[PDB]
Amino acid sequence: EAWIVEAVRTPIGKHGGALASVRPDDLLAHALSVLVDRSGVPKEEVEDVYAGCANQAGEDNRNVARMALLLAGFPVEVAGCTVNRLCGSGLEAVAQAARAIWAGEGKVYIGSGVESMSRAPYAVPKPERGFPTGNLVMYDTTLGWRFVNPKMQALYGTESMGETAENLAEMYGIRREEQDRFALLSHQKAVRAWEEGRFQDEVVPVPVKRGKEEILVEQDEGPRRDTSLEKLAALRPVFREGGTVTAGNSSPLNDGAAAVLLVSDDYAKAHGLRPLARVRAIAVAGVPPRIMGIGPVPATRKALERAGLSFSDLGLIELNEAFAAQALAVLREWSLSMEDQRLNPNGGAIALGHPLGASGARILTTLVHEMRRRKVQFGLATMCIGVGQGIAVVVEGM
Amino acid sequence: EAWIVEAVRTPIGKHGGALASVRPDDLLAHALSVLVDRSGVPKEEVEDVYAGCANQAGEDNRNVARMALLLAGFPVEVAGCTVNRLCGSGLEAVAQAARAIWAGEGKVYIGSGVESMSRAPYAVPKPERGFPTGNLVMYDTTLGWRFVNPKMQALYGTESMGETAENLAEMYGIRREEQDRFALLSHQKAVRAWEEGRFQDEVVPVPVKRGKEEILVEQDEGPRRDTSLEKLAALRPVFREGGTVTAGNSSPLNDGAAAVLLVSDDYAKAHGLRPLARVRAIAVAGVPPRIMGIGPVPATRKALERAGLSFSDLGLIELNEAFAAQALAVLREWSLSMEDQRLNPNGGAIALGHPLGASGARILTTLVHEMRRRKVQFGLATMCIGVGQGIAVVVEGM
Amino acid sequence: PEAWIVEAVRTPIGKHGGALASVRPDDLLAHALSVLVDRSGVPKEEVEDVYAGCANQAGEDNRNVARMALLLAGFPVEVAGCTVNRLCGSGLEAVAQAARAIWAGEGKVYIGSGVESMSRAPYAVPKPERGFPTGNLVMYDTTLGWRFVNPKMQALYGTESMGETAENLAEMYGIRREEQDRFALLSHQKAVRAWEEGRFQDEVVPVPVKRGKEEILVEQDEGPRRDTSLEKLAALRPVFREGGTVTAGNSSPLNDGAAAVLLVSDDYAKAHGLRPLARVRAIAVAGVPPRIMGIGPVPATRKALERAGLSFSDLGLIELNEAFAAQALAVLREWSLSMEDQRLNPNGGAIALGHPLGASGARILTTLVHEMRRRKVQFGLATMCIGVGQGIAVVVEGM
Amino acid sequence: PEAWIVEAVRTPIGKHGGALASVRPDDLLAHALSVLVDRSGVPKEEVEDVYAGCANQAGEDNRNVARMALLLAGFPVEVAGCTVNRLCGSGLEAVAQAARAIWAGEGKVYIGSGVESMSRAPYAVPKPERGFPTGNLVMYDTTLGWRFVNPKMQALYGTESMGETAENLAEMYGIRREEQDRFALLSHQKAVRAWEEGRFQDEVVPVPVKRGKEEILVEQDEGPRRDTSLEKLAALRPVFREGGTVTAGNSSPLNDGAAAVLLVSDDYAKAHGLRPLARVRAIAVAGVPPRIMGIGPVPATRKALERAGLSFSDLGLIELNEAFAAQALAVLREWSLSMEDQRLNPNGGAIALGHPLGASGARILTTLVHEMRRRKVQFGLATMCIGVGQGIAVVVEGM
């Protein structure tokens, strides 16, 4: 009933990098425009546009989805909503789109996500008294915990994502050598994937204006060919003294956008749209904040169950790489080796980038396209989510 | 299949008023706590929490749903996500919940919303160059357009909600006397509803700490008994010189939170939960930004059609009052009189308050409760949405 | 006699966010400047330059308030102006600056003044040093103290708050809690009594405050409290050091206020029939260790007295700014004086009246001069402690 | 002859966000202060008080930079300090203040300095006056000019920028674009020539800058450019008024820098064998209409010369701060002097060298004194225009 007929993503840029000049609302518009243009489905046919965004305080404020779809030239009739389940917002957007199609409402929906961590603004508290006294803090929304709630600090901590990654490394006994090794592979597969043209179909270039002339960013600037196991081992822990998680075996902060077009099976048939995949089942689940990294475990088991499938039926697995330590802990639960041919075949977030709000849709796009070329029947896309959550979506190729 | 077994809301406070000292995440936690406590449904039974929020830049940052549920004592397994479709986010949250139950994922979901416009922080842009020069702006997130996109400015304007209200008053020729008359009714019906105890069931008191001692806020502080038709006419236009929209015939800025508990029919039967109503159909639609006030029209039409009903089958209608002018324009299309006994029976946003993010769930709460007491079969909850959108939900009493 | 004080005025002192919080510093100072000249009978065009003290010039008091204020007050464009800043003692430095110019034989008419609007002090935000930064920033409240701290500074001397330096002194001189509060109770009583008996009617000039549509006239310091009791004072908890002694009650508050004094050359005074209020005898500035800035008046007063060829015993009126009961008493310890001395802050001190930083210096000088005239005292001393370790003192001879 | 200038030093002048943007003002000024005393052979404990000029004390230069800088520089705790602010002329005002104290027979050793780091000037934010406000706020960049504008001010005189008042002057005196660019070109050539020939080696003291892990030594003003041409200068577009004449090229930039001069009493100099560089003859300050603040030097130079009992023609060396080619030339008109005058800014002016506000006053006095000594001139003049309508001048006699 819910079919994925098109998937697109802008390349992923480094923080303050290649796409730091492009504002989120404009960035997402590029994705939305490109999705529809190559699909051959008039914009006017889209019923509603769901988009994921982790921080809607800056140029992405007041419902990016609606702002972006308008900017992209869609007719005024197309609706939009911005969903926010942090790291997993991108996937939640697709889930939301699918559920609508299943409910027999619209026939054409878009599931997307965007996040410009470079341009994330500062948030400043409002005074509560007349002529205050005392310094104030300007919170950088690019980062994490802010406007902290004392009651929150008391119930669970406010440990950084990086810290929870260490908590996992401890719990599962994931050594530094293994973390860096996992990281090296992410880079190697990504570099190889680009080099061999596997990203050419799903990636749509983004024009950047540098002063007077335009530049065309058309490749993720994250992957490095010179990544070596020696250099990776030279980096210092960054979240815990005498720790194990370093800047090299964890994802960076990035800018990016992704969008997938979903239509009802009947609609696809009536317009000759060739399916890329079909949404089989979705699941969401919560885990303790201190170890939000394993969120994919219970989410994937619930999803597989709902799709009446076994992990072993999966032929391609997209597990978002928030931290090597976290990803490996998840792999432990699944009894899988980082060398598994099905796992992040073209690289993961450690090398490609983790533009929060957009990653969910980003990884589903990479999954679907790869599923098609190697004709895999079942694929999984799942991510860990900040403050203790997980989301997973099971897709069936066609 | 998707049943509404409980609905609650905190009273609505004026800007910088009775609830200005309560932070959004905490406010929403009160609603979430109350919802389950009265239901007799253990927290661990909830599958996911959807919550709407128009501005997630302050104490409501990084997914308030998840933050709120944890603060409210829910176990770590309960998931949560924050939806944002501006003014209509509250309703989008319920729709989201319903579609999940229909998809047969979980059996217990919460659809809610929160908005503390009193504590909305300031947003400051990030520097793009080394040692800048020139003044910067601190955008007040309590208001409207910010970090404006030039392209947006060119395609459609960045007129304020209040201005779009005028555009409608002009388009439909809705006089000032008519608008103020409409506003007077909102107050009278609200004052009456409270006075007669119709809000007693749906409202849960919120404790506010004033220094050392606690005070219990237990009534909306918006409605005023001394509201007169003369006073209303003495106000000056606020959005357009020689205009018609005044601070008196338009909604204010407020703080508030609301939550509705939906459960699958099979679950309700297994646990003896008595249904308040059933979710029949949902519809979302877009309209030109310059007259977003009309959003309810195409959305209500789509929803009714999807529920296979006619406007005349409706026995109670909750049309959020963003502006007298806008509501009346909507009434024009429906060929309904502001005196219709089915319309906002206990008052509307002009007198009660419009805590953005929470309004959707807020009016749904008021609808369901009134539907039950007057044994109405079909009810409609619909609202206009910023930058040109509209959402509507048809519900069947039980 | 070369530099003569011929007029002294001050606006009432308001509480933080209080009665004058609505008035901006530049405008407030203008009121003082305008009033000083109006009642003097000396045309504004006669003034040579205007010195003014201001501890924080980041907000509405930016870019030399002196000049802004004077123009606002209707002075002709020819009158010059400069804003001096020696923190807590800026107000007095302003007067000293004026006197020294008159002695140098430059102009014949100068104004020494000060202003401080602690209520409207803005926030200061650092500038980015890199392209697309990352990390939280801080908005420093200029109403307070240490900000944009320099590591090197932190290393050499601390960055202990004024309140803490008060404690350091209470400890060093063993100034008990009962003593401190007793001293504070007196400040209030003398102040309440002085107002009550009209001793402030001459030196104070009412300030019009606009509340919405109508104007209100602020004409009395809102700091002094008749209900101040030794019981209440003792019930307050230390504010700067756990198990300490300095409370919010035995320390000065944060206030808004402005004051200005008109000085002229003696030959000018004689040529225009201006009756002298007093004559500036000697000035002295001195530094002391930051951690106990409170004693600053000590070395400064000895230097000033010596320069005026006088002994402490020749003083018939002493205005010692009350930054903290503990700090004042420590100074009194050095001078071997009792807080009961009839010469000491006869009409109350900052603890009860207020300490609008930049204006305090000129504020106490104004109160000294006026009281010197009514009780016909020959020698008066005005001295204050200054933040980060300094002290200033000015000796004046009545006429 | 009671006030003698025995030593003069200045740090090089950096561009906005340039070579010294990493150094904080308080630290920058400490360099000047340390350097001044180290080469004078006068123990720090001998210094009585330290005056410093600073146009914006809202950032790292808050709460009396003089006292912070002197402590940072290692001076003993007893040395006092105060920050004076007369905007563009604060640097000079600091020396004047030092001199006047020596004349009054207070201390024997004083320091007059100035500092300004326009690169790190913070942002200033207003304080809310109501509980839960609504409406956007503004973050004023203290690097610039008018801010927290007073409506009343706007109504009496405008709030025209310095650059604008430079145009008003250009118009009033009919100073053509070609003339302005020519003046600007000479400022660069004389500056480049001066450095190249080593005339700045004596007065300039290197500033160590930390660049990550290693130190770099900034030792030359980074403003002057050898490649400055009359053709390039003419290519620039007006920056303050459409179809105007003032360009970024014929105006001074925004810069960072610090300077300090050591003044001592004549009897002290004699008793310790200090060789005088110059003698402070007379000082004068004056106000002019804000819209044409550029001419401030005229009435101030007149009053100063008159107080020194000299005639303009007796001046053998003239340092007129170059705020704007247009402003400087208008002043030159009043004096009936040609920009070719061999006495005028011999080693270059602000347009090429830089205008680090608060420090420029002391900076130009330093360059004047040193040049006076090498070419054995007897009388020199240092004068500047001051924001919002003022001017200051100081007459010095070589020795």
Side-chain angles (χ1 to χ4, degrees):
Chain A
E1 170 101 87
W3 293 0
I4 292 172
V5 289
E6 210 74 43
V8 163
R9 73 178 187 71
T10 76
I12 297 181
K14 299 185 188 187
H15 178 67
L19 302 176
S21 50
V22 173
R23 1 191 313 168
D25 56 346
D26 279 323
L27 191 59
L28 178 49
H30 277 275
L32 298 185
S33 279
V34 178
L35 187 63
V36 165
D37 287 348
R38 64 181 60 180
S39 81
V41 195
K43 292 172 173 170
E44 39 156 56
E45 293 298 312
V46 177
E47 174 82 41
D48 180 10
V49 195
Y50 283 98
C53 186
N55 161 208
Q56 304 163 54
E59 293 159 351
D60 49 17
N61 83 73
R62 305 212 304 136
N63 187 13
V64 171
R66 175 56 168 180
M67 303 284 207
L69 77 82
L70 286 182
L71 282 165
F74 286 53
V76 113
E77 291 69 45
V78 165
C81 164
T82 303
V83 180
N84 177 22
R85 192 184 292 273
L86 292 183
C87 315
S89 303
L91 223 54
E92 173 76 30
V94 167
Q96 229 80 88
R99 291 204 180 75
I101 291 185
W102 293 337
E105 286 169 53
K107 303 286 191 172
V108 177
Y109 285 74
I110 289 187
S112 64
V114 61
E115 190 66 68
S116 173
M117 294 184 98
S118 302
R119 299 180 151 288
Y122 284 139
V124 182
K126 207 178 280 304
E128 295 178 49
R129 205 230 306 172
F131 293 76
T133 56
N135 312 321
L136 290 174
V137 182
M138 290 198 285
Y139 298 88
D140 171 32
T141 58
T142 302
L143 313 189
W145 283 114
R146 37 185 191 282
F147 297 78
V148 181
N149 181 322
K151 270 150 289 184
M152 182 63 240
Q153 246 297 312
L155 275 167
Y156 312 84
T158 62
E159 323 174 76
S160 61
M161 298 279 79
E163 286 191 287
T164 78
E166 279 289 335
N167 285 336
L168 277 197
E170 292 191 66
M171 187 178 296
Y172 287 57
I174 291 176
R175 305 284 300 192
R176 167 74 177 269
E177 27 284 30
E178 196 176 35
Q179 288 181 39
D180 288 328
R181 199 182 306 133
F182 177 105
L184 180 48
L185 270 190
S186 187
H187 276 291
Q188 307 186 300
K189 285 187 278 180
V191 181
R192 189 185 306 144
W194 261 115
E195 191 172 57
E196 271 158 48
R198 282 190 281 290
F199 278 136
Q200 229 215 74
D201 289 356
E202 61 177 65
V203 173
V204 54
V206 178
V208 175
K209 288 187 185 179
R210 272 192 179 177
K212 29 288 174 182
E213 271 309 302
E214 298 201 68
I215 294 182
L216 208 68
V217 177
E218 59 202 320
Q219 216 172 71
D220 308 299
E221 76 174 308
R224 316 190 243 76
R225 181 184 277 81
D226 58 313
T227 325
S228 83
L229 189 72
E230 328 103 40
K231 303 181 190 180
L232 231 50
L235 313 187
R236 51 182 81 189
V238 165
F239 306 108
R240 182 180 296 165
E241 300 197 304
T244 171
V245 176
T246 71
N249 48 63
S250 60
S251 70
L253 292 112
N254 317 64
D255 307 307
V260 46
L261 183 63
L262 300 87
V263 292
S264 67
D265 54 305
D266 60 292
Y267 185 93
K269 285 168 187 176
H271 296 302
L273 309 190
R274 182 201 189 191
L276 235 54
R278 158 207 289 169
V279 180
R280 255 257 190 163
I282 309 162
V284 85
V287 297
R290 59 123 44 205
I291 55 174
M292 65 95 199
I294 41 71
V297 162
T300 307
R301 87 142 183 280
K302 286 195 203 166
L304 281 177
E305 168 228 321
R306 283 170 180 160
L309 295 160
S310 280
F311 198 81
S312 40
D313 299 312
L314 296 178
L316 218 41
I317 306 169
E318 270 300 319
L319 176 67
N320 178 56
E321 324 188 331
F323 299 83
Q326 77 97 193
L328 288 175
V330 178
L331 288 183
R332 290 305 171 74
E333 284 304 334
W334 291 345
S335 301
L336 271 67
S337 298
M338 53 167 267
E339 15 239 90
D340 202 312
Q341 278 179 48
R342 293 169 298 172
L343 201 62
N344 311 339
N346 309 317
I350 298 189
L352 295 171
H354 187 27
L356 294 186
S359 295
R362 194 292 283 172
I363 64 179
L364 183 58
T365 291
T366 286
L367 166 50
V368 169
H369 278 276
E370 190 62 46
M371 277 175 69
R372 175 194 273 325
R373 62 179 52 103
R374 64 170 63 188
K375 296 159 184 178
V376 149
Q377 208 202 324
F378 297 81
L380 168 75
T382 180
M383 303 169 286
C384 70
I385 304 181
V387 199
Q389 263 177 293
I391 187 175
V393 173
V394 182
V395 181
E396 187 185 311
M398 297 197 278
Chain B
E1 166 95 51
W3 293 1
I4 301 179
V5 300
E6 186 80 44
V8 286
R9 77 180 182 71
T10 74
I12 305 166
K14 280 188 288 184
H15 177 105
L19 288 171
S21 64
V22 206
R23 26 153 62 199
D25 56 321
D26 279 331
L27 183 65
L28 174 56
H30 274 295
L32 297 195
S33 309
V34 175
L35 187 67
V36 302
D37 284 338
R38 315 175 159 189
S39 90
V41 166
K43 294 166 189 180
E44 44 148 48
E45 288 301 87
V46 183
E47 172 81 26
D48 191 20
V49 174
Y50 281 124
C53 192
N55 162 199
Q56 312 173 41
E59 291 162 340
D60 46 23
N61 84 75
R62 299 214 310 160
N63 192 8
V64 207
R66 180 61 182 186
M67 306 288 191
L69 71 73
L70 294 180
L71 292 152
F74 281 59
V76 135
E77 281 63 36
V78 198
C81 165
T82 292
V83 307
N84 167 56
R85 194 187 293 271
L86 291 157
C87 311
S89 301
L91 219 49
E92 181 69 47
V94 179
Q96 233 70 91
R99 292 201 192 67
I101 293 168
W102 293 337
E105 314 204 327
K107 295 201 168 314
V108 182
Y109 287 74
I110 286 178
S112 63
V114 59
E115 202 71 56
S116 183
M117 303 184 84
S118 298
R119 303 180 150 272
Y122 290 109
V124 181
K126 219 156 187 45
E128 287 180 56
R129 46 187 282 214
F131 286 68
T133 266
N135 295 359
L136 292 146
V137 189
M138 284 210 302
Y139 300 107
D140 176 19
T141 70
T142 301
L143 311 181
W145 290 98
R146 342 146 192 157
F147 297 98
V148 184
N149 185 317
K151 177 180 186 140
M152 174 62 232
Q153 249 296 303
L155 303 182
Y156 315 88
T158 66
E159 317 194 50
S160 55
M161 296 275 91
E163 283 182 285
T164 71
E166 276 294 350
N167 296 318
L168 275 177
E170 278 155 39
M171 190 182 283
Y172 290 80
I174 307 183
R175 307 198 160 185
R176 164 128 174 193
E177 33 277 314
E178 209 186 312
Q179 294 176 48
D180 293 304
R181 172 63 215 306
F182 181 106
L184 173 55
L185 267 180
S186 181
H187 275 288
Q188 315 181 316
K189 290 192 292 187
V191 182
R192 189 179 308 135
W194 260 111
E195 192 164 45
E196 305 180 336
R198 276 188 289 288
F199 283 130
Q200 273 300 294
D201 294 317
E202 66 180 69
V203 170
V204 57
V206 191
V208 301
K209 325 259 181 177
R210 279 183 185 170
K212 43 286 173 186
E213 278 310 301
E214 267 186 44
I215 306 185
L216 201 62
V217 181
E218 50 194 301
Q219 272 186 69
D220 310 304
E221 84 177 308
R224 44 204 188 192
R225 168 177 290 83
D226 67 281
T227 310
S228 90
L229 196 62
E230 258 186 64
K231 302 182 183 175
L232 235 64
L235 310 175
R236 293 101 314 102
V238 184
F239 304 89
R240 188 163 299 171
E241 290 313 297
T244 179
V245 175
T246 68
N249 52 38
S250 38
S251 64
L253 300 166
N254 306 82
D255 297 315
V260 44
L261 210 195
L262 308 76
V263 94
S264 80
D265 68 298
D266 55 287
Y267 185 109
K269 281 167 191 165
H271 296 265
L273 293 179
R274 176 188 173 197
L276 214 49
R278 141 151 82 74
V279 179
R280 259 249 181 174
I282 312 152
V284 117
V287 302
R290 58 120 41 206
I291 45 172
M292 60 85 244
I294 261 299
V297 169
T300 294
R301 174 173 63 60
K302 283 201 279 195
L304 283 181
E305 183 243 280
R306 280 170 177 162
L309 305 185
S310 276
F311 199 82
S312 69
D313 289 322
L314 296 186
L316 228 45
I317 320 171
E318 266 303 315
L319 180 59
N320 196 46
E321 319 176 321
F323 295 92
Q326 76 103 184
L328 284 178
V330 166
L331 292 187
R332 208 81 124 205
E333 292 299 336
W334 296 342
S335 294
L336 260 79
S337 155
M338 56 181 271
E339 304 308 316
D340 206 302
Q341 304 185 59
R342 299 174 288 167
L343 200 54
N344 305 56
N346 303 336
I350 292 184
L352 306 176
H354 184 13
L356 287 180
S359 292
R362 200 294 285 159
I363 65 167
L364 179 63
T365 285
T366 314
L367 172 60
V368 185
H369 277 275
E370 189 59 37
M371 281 177 63
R372 172 186 265 180
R373 56 176 74 90
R374 48 171 73 199
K375 293 174 184 180
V376 165
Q377 172 158 51
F378 303 111
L380 169 57
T382 185
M383 308 163 294
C384 66
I385 306 174
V387 196
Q389 265 175 299
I391 187 171
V393 196
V394 186
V395 146
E396 161 153 48
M398 306 206 280
Chain C
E2 182 90 30
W4 290 3
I5 296 185
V6 197
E7 208 60 51
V9 197
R10 81 180 173 73
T11 71
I13 304 178
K15 297 200 277 194
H16 180 84
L20 298 172
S22 117
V23 184
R24 29 188 312 164
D26 68 335
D27 285 332
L28 190 69
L29 185 75
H31 272 287
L33 299 183
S34 190
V35 176
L36 182 74
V37 144
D38 290 318
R39 52 178 64 176
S40 73
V42 180
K44 289 164 196 172
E45 38 147 53
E46 290 285 356
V47 189
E48 176 68 19
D49 186 19
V50 161
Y51 285 106
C54 191
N56 148 211
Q57 300 155 41
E60 285 157 347
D61 46 32
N62 82 77
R63 299 210 308 143
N64 189 38
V65 222
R67 176 65 176 168
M68 302 290 189
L70 72 75
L71 291 186
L72 282 168
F75 280 61
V77 128
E78 283 67 40
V79 189
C82 176
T83 296
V84 288
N85 170 27
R86 193 183 296 267
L87 281 182
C88 311
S90 293
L92 223 44
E93 179 71 47
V95 180
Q97 236 64 99
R100 306 222 191 84
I102 295 178
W103 294 338
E106 312 191 323
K108 298 202 159 302
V109 174
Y110 283 74
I111 294 185
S113 52
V115 61
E116 196 70 61
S117 164
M118 301 188 89
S119 306
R120 294 178 155 269
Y123 292 109
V125 171
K127 251 174 168 186
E129 292 178 56
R130 188 227 312 171
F132 281 71
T134 261
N136 301 330
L137 290 177
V138 171
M139 285 198 9
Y140 299 93
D141 176 35
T142 72
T143 304
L144 309 183
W146 289 96
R147 36 191 200 278
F148 293 96
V149 177
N150 185 171
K152 186 178 186 179
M153 178 62 215
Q154 236 304 309
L156 304 166
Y157 318 72
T159 31
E160 323 187 51
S161 59
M162 296 291 87
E164 283 180 297
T165 68
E167 265 301 333
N168 297 306
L169 275 169
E171 275 150 47
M172 177 183 281
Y173 294 82
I175 309 166
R176 295 185 187 167
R177 169 55 173 288
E178 19 283 315
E179 209 184 334
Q180 293 192 55
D181 300 316
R182 199 185 306 127
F183 173 100
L185 178 60
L186 284 202
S187 176
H188 278 274
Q189 310 188 309
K190 297 192 279 189
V192 172
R193 220 180 300 130
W195 259 113
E196 195 173 56
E197 304 179 321
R199 287 192 280 291
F200 282 123
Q201 204 204 53
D202 290 4
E203 67 184 76
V204 180
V205 67
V207 176
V209 180
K210 257 157 190 173
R211 278 200 201 176
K213 46 288 173 185
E214 298 302 312
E215 294 204 74
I216 299 179
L217 196 60
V218 180
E219 58 202 299
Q220 220 178 68
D221 307 304
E222 71 175 318
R225 296 184 300 279
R226 177 175 276 84
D227 68 304
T228 298
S229 77
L230 197 50
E231 176 189 326
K232 286 179 183 184
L233 235 15
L236 305 182
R237 290 283 149 189
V239 187
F240 311 115
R241 188 166 293 169
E242 289 54 56
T245 61
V246 183
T247 80
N250 58 63
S251 43
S252 74
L254 305 178
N255 314 85
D256 299 313
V261 39
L262 176 70
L263 285 74
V264 305
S265 69
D266 70 323
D267 72 283
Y268 180 92
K270 290 166 185 179
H272 287 284
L274 300 187
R275 185 199 182 196
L277 202 42
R279 161 219 300 192
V280 177
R281 261 252 200 170
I283 315 163
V285 118
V288 299
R291 55 131 34 214
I292 60 181
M293 57 116 263
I295 43 168
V298 163
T301 288
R302 92 149 164 286
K303 280 213 274 192
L305 283 169
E306 189 256 61
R307 293 177 191 175
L310 303 181
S311 306
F312 194 76
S313 64
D314 292 303
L315 293 184
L317 221 46
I318 308 167
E319 273 287 315
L320 178 64
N321 198 45
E322 322 188 312
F324 297 98
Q327 77 117 191
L329 291 156
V331 181
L332 292 174
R333 282 274 200 296
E334 291 295 315
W335 291 341
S336 307
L337 247 74
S338 174
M339 55 182 257
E340 315 293 343
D341 199 302
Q342 277 162 50
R343 294 173 289 161
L344 190 40
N345 305 306
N347 302 306
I351 298 182
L353 306 176
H355 180 34
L357 300 196
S360 296
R363 196 293 290 173
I364 61 174
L365 180 51
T366 298
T367 303
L368 171 58
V369 196
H370 276 273
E371 191 70 346
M372 271 177 69
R373 160 179 281 175
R374 69 173 53 89
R375 47 167 91 190
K376 298 156 184 179
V377 161
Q378 174 172 40
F379 304 112
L381 180 69
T383 187
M384 307 177 285
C385 67
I386 305 179
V388 191
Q390 266 174 283
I392 186 179
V394 170
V395 188
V396 155
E397 187 170 15
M399 311 208 291
Chain D
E2 252 204 302
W4 291 356
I5 285 177
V6 191
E7 210 67 68
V9 192
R10 74 187 188 74
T11 75
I13 296 184
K15 275 194 292 182
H16 178 84
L20 302 190
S22 59
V23 176
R24 8 183 321 146
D26 68 322
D27 266 332
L28 188 60
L29 175 54
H31 268 292
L33 292 185
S34 297
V35 176
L36 187 73
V37 189
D38 292 341
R39 80 184 49 175
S40 84
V42 174
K44 284 169 190 151
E45 36 143 53
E46 290 298 337
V47 185
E48 171 84 37
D49 184 13
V50 178
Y51 287 108
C54 176
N56 162 201
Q57 301 153 50
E60 288 152 349
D61 47 31
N62 80 82
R63 302 225 303 159
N64 191 40
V65 233
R67 177 58 165 176
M68 307 283 209
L70 126 169
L71 277 191
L72 281 157
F75 287 55
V77 122
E78 300 82 357
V79 193
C82 160
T83 294
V84 290
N85 171 64
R86 197 186 289 276
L87 288 188
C88 318
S90 297
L92 221 58
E93 174 69 35
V95 182
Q97 223 63 73
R100 298 231 188 74
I102 288 173
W103 293 341
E106 307 196 322
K108 298 290 183 193
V109 194
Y110 288 95
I111 294 180
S113 59
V115 70
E116 202 66 73
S117 184
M118 300 191 90
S119 291
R120 340 202 82 215
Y123 289 120
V125 195
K127 263 190 182 310
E129 296 175 60
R130 186 223 329 176
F132 297 71
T134 99
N136 300 337
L137 300 175
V138 183
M139 295 190 274
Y140 300 84
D141 174 34
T142 63
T143 292
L144 315 192
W146 288 103
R147 40 205 217 251
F148 295 94
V149 180
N150 185 326
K152 293 163 191 172
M153 176 59 256
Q154 241 305 307
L156 294 186
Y157 314 79
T159 58
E160 327 203 64
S161 59
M162 300 287 88
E164 301 201 283
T165 63
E167 286 287 30
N168 291 318
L169 272 193
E171 297 178 51
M172 182 182 295
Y173 291 49
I175 301 158
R176 317 210 72 182
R177 169 61 181 278
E178 27 283 323
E179 293 181 61
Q180 287 176 59
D181 292 335
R182 200 162 82 70
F183 177 114
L185 170 60
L186 293 192
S187 192
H188 277 281
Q189 310 181 311
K190 287 180 292 170
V192 181
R193 182 152 53 243
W195 262 109
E196 186 176 53
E197 288 182 57
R199 279 190 289 295
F200 279 129
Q201 211 205 71
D202 290 329
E203 59 183 70
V204 184
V205 53
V207 177
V209 187
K210 230 86 165 186
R211 234 286 171 168
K213 30 288 165 186
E214 283 315 300
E215 286 201 57
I216 295 173
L217 199 69
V218 177
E219 51 197 304
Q220 269 200 34
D221 304 304
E222 90 179 309
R225 32 206 182 66
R226 171 172 273 86
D227 57 292
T228 173
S229 85
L230 207 65
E231 291 123 23
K232 295 179 178 181
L233 251 340
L236 309 207
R237 352 64 225 202
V239 188
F240 303 102
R241 258 156 72 284
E242 161 201 300
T245 91
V246 180
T247 65
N250 69 62
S251 285
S252 80
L254 312 184
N255 315 71
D256 305 296
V261 55
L262 177 61
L263 289 77
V264 75
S265 75
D266 63 315
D267 50 275
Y268 189 95
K270 289 166 177 162
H272 302 279
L274 302 184
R275 170 193 170 192
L277 228 325
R279 188 167 82 172
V280 191
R281 256 238 174 174
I283 310 171
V285 77
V288 314
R291 53 176 309 283
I292 48 171
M293 61 101 217
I295 53 166
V298 179
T301 299
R302 145 170 82 263
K303 287 206 287 180
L305 271 175
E306 184 235 87
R307 287 178 173 159
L310 298 158
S311 305
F312 200 78
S313 52
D314 299 35
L315 292 169
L317 210 35
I318 293 155
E319 271 295 327
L320 174 60
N321 193 43
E322 332 191 316
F324 297 107
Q327 82 92 193
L329 295 169
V331 173
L332 288 179
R333 302 276 238 192
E334 291 298 324
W335 292 338
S336 301
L337 297 196
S338 183
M339 68 181 245
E340 353 247 77
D341 199 302
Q342 283 187 53
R343 307 173 281 165
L344 185 64
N345 301 332
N347 296 312
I351 309 180
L353 294 166
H355 186 31
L357 285 178
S360 287
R363 199 289 288 170
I364 58 179
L365 179 53
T366 305
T367 303
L368 171 61
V369 171
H370 278 279
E371 179 70 68
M372 278 180 69
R373 173 194 260 169
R374 65 176 58 89
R375 56 171 71 184
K376 304 179 175 189
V377 170
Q378 180 167 30
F379 304 87
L381 175 109
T383 179
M384 306 170 275
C385 69
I386 289 175
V388 193
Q390 269 186 280
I392 183 179
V394 177
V395 176
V396 180
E397 182 190 310
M399 300 203 288

